[PDB]
């Protein structure tokens, strides 16, 4: 029996337990504290005041901002209890303690005690004990850092570079300690993800850092934001939402971040190369950078991305170290005939469910030669159901030859698993009023593939077709004629926004059901939008747009 203090504090309340990880962004509504992940066992439960037992987190880096807002409003759970390593929620609780004077206790239990305490009705937490229904267990004090700090590190910690840089280093050093790191590491560039207006606290944190003089030290790009920056007012986004959403993006631009406003920064000319140590947030971008590009970055939670960008330093832990990039589980993936584009996001989705807390190696798929866009959609879906910052695909990704860990077990993803996943992501009617493409932001190749399927035809007037992409890709599609061909088919191409941050009336209010080819938005979409969401191929979506209807059936490779 072992209880370990991760973050100190005292709490008490009803046990809310689960064996499946939850992403607080997209899975918890900051307005109510209710679970909105329609595929999670806790869907509908309000977590406010409860003691949340779950093995670890999964999915989005933005959970840190959602949790912080929940702590600032009083709708957060009273405590968090894990049984494995965790970063996103712990970081959000650590920011709350460091900068907002709010303590949320976070405890990690051994797996046996986690299950035992999961069945309890009530839990109390104090700084020395955890008791579940009349059995008190001692809580070991937090791990204190065996951290090496350079002279420049200690100068930053001391305030030599101002208070903003100091607060940034304090958070980095606290994170390195809880990750058991023995040093920090230089990063060459950043990618900020907390620029999505996921909660009022996302703005509050950014304006606090910016008001202390925060500024980035390495070149740093920006993820998707919550307004079409140049057009949201003409678009009719309410001033109560669009004004803080625009000020959030403005705060990071003030701090020196490049206004790329895209969740596919690996498509930019500034994309990192193999072996390069970067510090990125946004789950799909982190996984793509490690998996496909071979660059190196942990899955940094929101807020921590800014601190890393401000100091040029990240904790030397996780996938920054070569040994931690070795496969930790083997997944034999069935290879049916007649694969189309929808295969790869489904495979990523199911791989995350099967491997939610370690780095898998997908075997059996190399000869299918997935495209860069296939791998992009795969990593995005994998970054929905798993916490891992990277994966490997045998015969496809550049590090797939690394020796698996001596402890790697072998599991499979069957055709039966795929048929189950397909129906799961297809809980909706056949009528649709919207086709949603571009989560993560569409590449130029994807915009060209979409145009090819449309084949010069125009969408049914009943079915809006919206593509979200980065500004640089839209500019490139404007120059090669792809953009005009899409507008000729009635397709609206939006910059800056993504499906994770879109809102009404840019998201058309008349929508009742939408179809998407994104495994990621298929999962998050129902709880984010309130609409029904269908998942399908690129051509499934286009046929939906041309006819007005998306037929409910398993695809060719599933027959
Ligand atoms: O890391 C993630 O997955 C989240 N960042 C912003 C939106 C969502 O993608
Ligand atoms: S912001 Fe979540 S994938 Fe675009």
Give me the domains of the chain, ranges plus CATH numbers.
Answer: 3-140 (3.50.30.10), 151-322 (3.30.499), 326-423 (no CATH), 425-558 (3.30.499.10)
State the helix-helix crossing angle for 343-354 and 519-529, rounded to 10 degrees.
Answer: 80
Whether 104 contacts 9, CB under 8 Å: yes
Count Cβ atoms within 10 A of the Cβ of residue 105 and give its class: 0-12 exposed, 13-18 middle, 19 or more buried: buried
Q: What is the distance in A from the centroid of ligand 2 to the CA of 263?
A: 5
Protein residue with its CA nearest to atom 7 in ligand 1: 500
Whether 499 contacts 384, CB under 8 Å: no
Whole-number Å distance between alpha carbons of 326 and 358: 10
Protein residue with its CA nearest to atom 5 in ligand 1: 282
Question: Ligand 2 pocket, 224 CB below 6 A?
Answer: yes
Q: What is the distance in A from the centroid of ligand 2 to the CA of 507?
A: 15
Whole-number Å distance between alpha carbons of 177 and 24: 23
Closest CA to 537 of 329, 374, 293, 404: 374
H helix or E strand, kind and range, residue 115 = helix 111-118
In three-state secondary structure terms, 416 is helix
Contacts of residue 532, defined as CB under 8 A and 6 or more positions apart, other chains included, come to 427, 428, 429, 512, 513, 514, 526
Distance of CA 212 to the CA centre of its chain: 28
Whole-number Å distance between alpha carbons of 286 and 390: 7
Integer-rounded Cα Rg, in Å, for the chain is 22
Token pair belonging to 92 = 């959000």
Whether 387 contacts 356, CB under 8 Å: yes
Contacts of residue 134, defined as CB under 8 A and 6 or more positions apart, other chains included, come to none
Q: Across 370-408, where does the E strand assignment appear?
A: 392-393
The alpha carbon torsion through 443, 447, 453, 458 (nearest 10 deg) reads: 150
Whole-number Å distance between alpha carbons of 264 and 439: 9
Query: Helix, strand, coil % (nearest 5) of the chain?
Result: 35, 20, 45
Distance of CA 276 to the CA centre of its chain: 21
In three-state secondary structure terms, 29 is coil
Whether 255 contacts 216, CB under 8 Å: yes
Sign (positive or negative) of CA dihedral 146, 147, 149, 153? negative
H-assigned helices in 386-470: 415-424, 444-454
| Atom number in ligand 2 closest to CA 520 | 3
Resolution of the solved structure (Å): 2.0
Count Cβ atoms within 10 A of the Cβ of residue 548 and give its class: 0-12 exposed, 13-18 middle, 19 or more buried: middle
Closest CA to 75 of 99, 48, 98: 48
In three-state secondary structure terms, 46 is strand
Contacts of residue 447, defined as CB under 8 A and 6 or more positions apart, other chains included, come to 467, 469, 473, 477, 482, 483, 486, 493
Whether 256 contacts 211, CB under 8 Å: no
Q: What is the distance in A from the centroid of ligand 1 to the CA of 194?
A: 9
Residue 468, beta-bridge partner list: 494
The alpha carbon torsion through 501, 66, 381, 509 (nearest 10 deg) reads: -30
**CB neighbourhood size of 3 (10 A):** 21
Count Cβ atoms within 10 A of the Cβ of residue 369 and give its class: 0-12 exposed, 13-18 middle, 19 or more buried: exposed
State the helix-helix crossing angle for 444-454 and 372-385, rounded to 10 degrees.
Answer: 110
Whole-number Å distance between alpha carbons of 81 and 100: 21
| Atom number in ligand 2 closest to CA 468 | 4
Contacts of residue 304, defined as CB under 8 A and 6 or more positions apart, other chains included, come to 64, 91, 171, 172, 175, 281
Of the CA atoms within 13 Å of residue 85, those in its CB half-sphere come to: 16
Contacts of residue 497, defined as CB under 8 A and 6 or more positions apart, other chains included, come to 224, 225, 226, 227, 228, 468, 506
Question: Ligand 2 pocket, 498 CB below 6 A?
Answer: yes
Token pair belonging to 52 = 């949340």
Count Cβ atoms within 10 A of the Cβ of residue 227 and give its class: 0-12 exposed, 13-18 middle, 19 or more buried: buried
* Probe target for ligand 1 pocket from 61, 248, 281, 389, with the most ligand atoms within 8 Å of CB: 61
Q: What is the distance in A from the centroid of ligand 1 to the CA of 510?
A: 26
CA distances from 440 to 288, 381, 497 (A): 11, 10, 10
Mode of pairing for the β-strands spanning 409-413 and 329-333: parallel
Token pair belonging to 532 = 């029904």
In three-state secondary structure terms, 186 is strand
Mode of pairing for the β-strands spanning 122-125 and 136-140: unpaired
Sign (positive or negative) of CA dihedral 429, 430, 436, 439? positive
| Atom number in ligand 2 closest to CA 438 | 4
Q: What is the distance in A from the centroid of ligand 2 to the CA of 199?
A: 16
Whole-number Å distance between alpha carbons of 242 and 530: 20
CA distances from 229 to 259, 262, 495 (A): 10, 12, 8
H helix or E strand, kind and range, residue 485 = helix 482-488
Q: Across 170-218, where does the E strand assignment appear?
A: 184-186, 190-192
Residue found under tokens 């500019």: 475
H helix or E strand, kind and range, residue 376 = helix 372-385
Token pair belonging to 165 = 């840089």
The alpha carbon torsion through 520, 524, 530, 534 (nearest 10 deg) reads: 30
Whole-number Å distance between alpha carbons of 436 and 216: 34
* Probe target for ligand 1 pocket from 60, 64, 196, with the most ligand atoms within 8 Å of CB: 60
Residue 16, beta-bridge partner list: 52
Token pair belonging to 264 = 């596919």
Whether 157 contacts 170, CB under 8 Å: yes
Contacts of residue 268, defined as CB under 8 A and 6 or more positions apart, other chains included, come to 221, 260, 262, 470, 472
Whole-number Å distance between alpha carbons of 206 and 310: 12
| Atom number in ligand 2 closest to CA 499 | 4
Residue 57, beta-bridge partner list: 22
Whether 141 contacts 107, CB under 8 Å: no
Largest CA distance in the chain: 70
């Amino acid at each position: 029996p072992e209880a370990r203090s991760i973050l100190a504090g005292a709490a008490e309340g009803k046990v809310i337990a689960t064996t499946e990880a939850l992403s607080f962004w997209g899975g918890v509504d900051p307005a109510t504290g209710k679970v909105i992940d329609v595929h999670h066992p806790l869907h509908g439960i309000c977590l406010t005041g409860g003691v949340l037992f779950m093995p670890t987190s999964r999915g989005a880096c933005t959970g840190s901002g959602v949790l912080l807002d929940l702590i600032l409003t009083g709708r957060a759970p009273s405590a968090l209890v894990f049984c494995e390593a965790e970063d996103v929620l712990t970081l959000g609780a650590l920011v709350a303690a460091e900068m907002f004077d709010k303590a949320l206790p976070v405890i990690r239990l051994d797996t046996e005690t986690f299950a035992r305490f999961s069945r309890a009705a009530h839990v109390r937490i104090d700084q020395n004990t955890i008791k579940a229904d009349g059995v008190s267990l001692a809580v070991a004090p937090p791990a204190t850092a065996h951290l090496d700090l350079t002279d420049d590190d200690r100068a930053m910690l001391e305030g030599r570079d101002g208070i903003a840089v100091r607060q940034a280093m304090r958070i980095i050093v606290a994170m390195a300690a809880q990750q058991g790191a023995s040093a920090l590491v230089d990063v060459t560039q950043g990618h900020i993800d907390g620029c999505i207006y996921a909660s009022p606290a996302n703005l509050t944190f950014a304006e606090k850092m910016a008001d202390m003089g925060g500024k980035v030290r390495v070149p740093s790009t920006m993820n998707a934001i919550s307004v079409d920056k140049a057009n949201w007012r003409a678009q009719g986004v309410p001033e109560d939402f669009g004004d803080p959403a625009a000020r959030l993006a403005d705060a990071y631009v003030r701090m020196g971040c490049r206004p790329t406003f895209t969740c596919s920064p690996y498509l930019l000319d500034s994309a990192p190369s193999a072996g390069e140590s970067i510090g990125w947030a946004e789950s799909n971008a982190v996984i793509f950078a490690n998996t496909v590009l071979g660059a190196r970055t942990a899955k940094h939670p929101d807020f921590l991305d800014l601190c890393i960008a401000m100091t040029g330093r990240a904790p030397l832990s996780g996938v920054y170290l070569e040994e931690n990039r070795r496969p930790q589980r083997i997944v034999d993936v069935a290879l049916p005939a007649g694969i189309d584009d929808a295969f790869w996001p489904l495979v990523g989705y199911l791989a995350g469910k099967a491997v939610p807390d370690c780095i898998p190696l997908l075997r059996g798929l190399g000869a299918a030669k997935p495209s860069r866009d296939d791998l992009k959609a795969l990593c995005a879906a994998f970054g929905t159901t798993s916490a891992s910052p990277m994966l490997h695909i045998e015969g496809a990704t550049p590090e797939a030859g690394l020796a698996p860990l001596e402890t790697a077990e072998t599991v499979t993803i069957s055709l039966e698993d795929m048929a189950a996943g397909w129906s799961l992501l297809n809980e909706g009617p056949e009528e649709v009023q919207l086709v949603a493409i571009g989560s993560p932001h569409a590449s130029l190749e994807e915009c060209r593939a979409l145009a090819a399927v449309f084949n010069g035809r125009k969408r049914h007037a009943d079915v809006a077709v919206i593509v979200t992409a980065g500004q640089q890709v839209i500019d490139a599609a404007g120059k090669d004629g792809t953009l005009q061909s899409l507008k000729d088919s009635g397709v609206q191409v939006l910059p800056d926004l993504c499906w994770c941050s879109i809102s009404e009336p840019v998201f058309p209010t008349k929508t009742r059901a939408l179809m998407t080819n994104s495994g990621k938005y298929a999962h998050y979409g129902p709880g984010l939008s309130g609409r029904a969401v269908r998942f399908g191929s690129l051509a499934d979506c286009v046929e939906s747009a041309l006819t007005g209807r998306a037929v409910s059936r398993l695809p060719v490779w599933l027959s």
